[PDB]
Amino acid sequence: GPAIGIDLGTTYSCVGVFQHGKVEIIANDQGNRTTPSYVAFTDTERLIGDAAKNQVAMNPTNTIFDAKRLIGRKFEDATVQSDMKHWPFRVVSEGGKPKVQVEYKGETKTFFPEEISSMVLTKMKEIAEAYLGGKVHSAVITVPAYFNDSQRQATKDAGTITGLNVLRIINEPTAAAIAYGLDKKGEKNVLIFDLGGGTFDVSILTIEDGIFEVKSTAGDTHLGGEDFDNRMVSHLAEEFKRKHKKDIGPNKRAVRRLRTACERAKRTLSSSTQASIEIDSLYEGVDFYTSITRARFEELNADLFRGTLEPVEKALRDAKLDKGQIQEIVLVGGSTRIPKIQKLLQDFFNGKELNKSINPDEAVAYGAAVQAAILIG
């Protein structure tokens, strides 16, 4: 004891505790209820989580994210060779295994993906110990349903290196179903729709007498909230050009700053119909203050939002199920807060109500925490 759940996400992680019959999701030292799965190596130190993400633009070659895309795989694997093309850090081979290669304290170092994930897990462990007091011993840690045994074991090894007793590795869609108590709610076919910052996972589960079976999986491992932000960046960069006769495109700091504003404006647009952009000296000392509507944001993303229904139809086909045979739909990932996404999914399911009352970026850690409590007794 205590009963701890960890969602070890590819870009963000979340930790929960089960205390007094209820889950508490734990904020970190910056007050954030999710923590970047980021590890940065500098001239003097190792930075993890927010501190690592906050200096990413300044130190991109020595700042690791997406270690979850490498964990448990071989360097020769097609996904690894493909992913390597879009990362600013170096990935190398040792005994056929991938490792990130970085500069740390003026020297070249290499780390297995489970070593990076262990550093992330140590941060999640310290986040829970600051909240609880004392030491955390045990955790349930989640993985995607399509992870194979090598990926599960290497995830566990990250827990081991961290010094956690890994009670169980469970599937992220299963954790989400557990958070909603769908294994105690009066067989059920459950669709989990998990749309994060850089991944889209659709899973179909069956649940009976507390037993979960994965029936099908589908999605896009390179689609998420970041793609929506890209569409807003291009729109507003064109507007800046139109109003100020300055093209920011070749200037990577100005583009990065616009993306930061767009990420935040997008978040506002899930609860308000307009968001304000307020950038001081975006380019050549010229301010960019402007306003963007929800309807404009939905327009710029018409394909990407409607496109999320294709993996739903595919997972149904693979499960050999009609959409009418789904008893529960669960929203997971920060992106499922987007109202237009909620509406497209609900209309597809003929007006069916969505399970969405639990913060969608917290649902996975929430169910992992419930599971930890069960196993600890």
- What HEC string does the chain produce? CCEEEEECCCCEEEEEEEECCEEEECCCCCCCCCEECCEEECCCCEEECHHHHHCCCCCHHHEECCHHHCCCCCCCCHHHHHHHHHCCCEEEEECCEEEEEEEECCEEEEECHHHHHHHHHHHHHHHHHHHHCCCCCEEEEEECCCCCHHHHHHHHHHHHHHCCEEEEEEEHHHHHHHHCCCCCCCCEEEEEEEECCCCEEEEEEEEECCEEEEEEEEEECCCCHHHHHHHHHHHHHHHHHHHHCCCCCCCHHHHHHHHHHHHHHHHHCCCCCEEEEEEEEEECCEEEEEEEEHHHHHHHCHHHHHHCHHHHHHHHHHHCCCHHHCCEEEEECHHHHCHHHHHHHHHHCCCCCCECCCCCCCHHHHHHHHHHHHHHC
Domain boundaries for CATH 3.30.30.30 within the chain? 65-119
Pick the closest to residue 72 from 31, 117, 110, 125 (CA basis). Answer: 117
- The CATH T-level fold of domain 185-223+308-355 is Nucleotidyltransferase; domain 5 (3.30.420)
Count other Cβ atoms within 10 Å, centred on residue 265: 22
Strands 22-25 and 12-19: what pairing? antiparallel
Contacts of 49 (CB under 8 A, 6+ apart): 13, 28, 35, 36, 38, 120, 123
Known binding residue 118? Answer is: no
The C-alpha torsion from 217 through 221 and 224 to 229, rounded to 10°, is -160
Pick the closest to residue 116 from 37, 52, 24 (CA basis). Answer: 37
Catalytic residues: 7, 68, 172, 194
Alpha carbon distance 354, 351 (integer Å): 9
Sheet of strand 328-332: strand arrangement: 211-220, 200-208, 188-195, 328-332
How big is the chain, counted in residues?
A: 377
Count Cβ atoms within 10 A of the Cβ of residue 251 and give its class: 0-12 exposed, 13-18 middle, 19 or more buried. Answer: middle
Alpha carbon distance 188, 165 (integer Å): 32
Count Cβ atoms within 10 A of the Cβ of residue 263 and give its class: 0-12 exposed, 13-18 middle, 19 or more buried. Answer: middle
CATH class of segment(s) 65-119:
alpha beta
The tokens describing 101, both together, are 């290669």
Q: Which amino acid is at 244?
A: H
The C-alpha torsion from 327 through 333 and 336 to 338, rounded to 10°, is 170
Known binding residue 197? Answer is: yes
Alpha carbon distance 334, 9 (integer Å): 12
Alpha carbon distance 375, 377 (integer Å): 6
Known binding residue 289? Answer is: no
Structure solved using which method?
X-ray
Backbone interruptions in the chain following residues (C to N > 2.5 Å): 186
Q: Are 15 and 124 in contact (CB under 8 A)?
A: yes
Domain boundaries for CATH 3.90.640.10 within the chain? 224-307
Domain boundaries for CATH 3.30.420.40 within the chain? 1-64+120-184+356-377, 185-223+308-355
Pick the closest to residue 66 from 124, 140, 9 (CA basis). Answer: 9
Superfamily, domain 1-64+120-184+356-377: ATPase, nucleotide binding domain (3.30.420.40)
Known binding residue 38? Answer is: no
Candidates 3.40.630.30, 3.90.640.10, 3.30.70.100, 3.40.50.300; correct CATH number of 224-307? 3.90.640.10
